[PDB]
Amino acid sequence: LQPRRVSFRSPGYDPSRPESFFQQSFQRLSRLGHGSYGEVFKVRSKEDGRLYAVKRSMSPFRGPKDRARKLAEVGSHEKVGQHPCCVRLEQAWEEGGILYLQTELCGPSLQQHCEAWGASLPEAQVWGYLRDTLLALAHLHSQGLVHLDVKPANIFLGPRGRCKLGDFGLLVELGEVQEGDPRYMAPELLQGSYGTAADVFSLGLTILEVACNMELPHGGEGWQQLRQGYLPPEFTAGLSSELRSVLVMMLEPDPKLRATAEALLALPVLRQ
Ligand SMILES: CN(C)C(=O)c1ccc(-c2cnc3c(-c4ccc(F)c5[nH]ncc45)c(N)c(=O)[nH]c3c2)cc1
């Protein structure tokens, strides 16, 4: 069984040894995460000795559609291309029905960071993370790409207080869609209206969660409250008027009237 490269366009590996290309070309350092998606390892390459993060799928390909669904994340990484605020894909391959993606190594997810601090984040960090993810979203939306899964778990920290948007498994190209996280779902997604506006709403709820340390409702009464155009009165009080103002713009229920990422980045408060 041989590793096949995956794209939409190996010195330490001896093709005669039984160990996988993953186990022969890399040094596993630590397991970053495991879920139904598979595992994510912090690895150092046995070739160049740089730090990367490798994600492998859990089970072998169940069928053609399951294979196509998994390989689409690689296509999504390529359409995004090179951007400072996007997790770069280095290479992807498949071996034995398992899909392997090798990205640059980042810091903790914004979710892990907030968990560690266990309180709200100070607004200085929030504005930086808002600006970085808005820069990512503006880069995606300028190419008719919609992320559809903006949330703390899919934003990853960078050095000196930067962060990068990641996990492009749900990304779609306007011109086919999977179930997003309902906690961060834009209201128009419920009635089949998909578009770049949806990413702006998801970021606003992302920012509302990290800046207020509040957990988002999966559904029901509270879910409706966050989607009527008023921020929740208890949690909003700590925020500044400018932040409260921008969150209201991002959380506008109507996608036709919702500020775009380009419009946001052009506001005074979101300066360089
Ligand atoms: C309880 N628990 C275990 C968790 O909460 C949890 C779960 C997962 C992760 C995680 C996931 N992934 C990565 C990736 C990553 C890899 C491959 C890809 F194809 C990617 N696309 N976008 C990004 C990535 C990195 N690069 C990176 O630095 N750290 C990561 C950390 C962190 C914490």
Curated annotation (Swiss-Prot):
Catalytic machinery residues: D149 (proton acceptor)
Gene Ontology MF, one: metal ion binding
Gene Ontology BP terms: G2/M transition of mitotic cell cycle; meiotic cell cycle; mitotic cell cycle; negative regulation of G2/M transition of mitotic cell cycle; negative regulation of G2/MI transition of meiotic cell cycle; regulation of cyclin-dependent protein serine/threonine kinase activity; regulation of mitotic nuclear division
Keyword annotations of the record: Acetylation, ATP-binding, Cell cycle, Endoplasmic reticulum, Golgi apparatus, Kinase, Magnesium, Membrane, Metal-binding, Nucleotide-binding, Phosphoprotein, Serine/threonine-protein kinase, Transferase
Any one annotated GO CC term: Golgi membrane
Metal-binding found in the keyword field: yes
Residues the record lists as binding ATP: L32, G33, H34, G35, S36, Y37, G38, E39, V40, K55
Activity regulation annotation text: Negatively regulated by hyperphosphorylation during mitosis. The hyperphosphorylated form does not associate with CCNB1-CDC2 complexes. The PLK1 protein kinase may be required for mitotic phosphorylation.
Residues bound to Mg(2+) 2: G169
Known catalytic reactions: L-seryl-[protein] + ATP = O-phospho-L-seryl-[protein] + ADP + H(+); L-threonyl-[protein] + ATP = O-phospho-L-threonyl-[protein] + ADP + H(+)
Membrane topology: Peripheral membrane protein
Description of how the protein assembles with itself and partners: Interacts with CDC2-CCNB1 complex. Can also interact with PIN1 when phosphorylated by CDC2-CCNB1.
Family indicated by similarity: Belongs to the protein kinase superfamily. Ser/Thr protein kinase family. WEE1 subfamily.
The protein's name in its UniProt record: Membrane-associated tyrosine- and threonine-specific cdc2-inhibitory kinase
Species of origin: Homo sapiens
Location of this fragment in the whole protein: 77 to 361 of 499
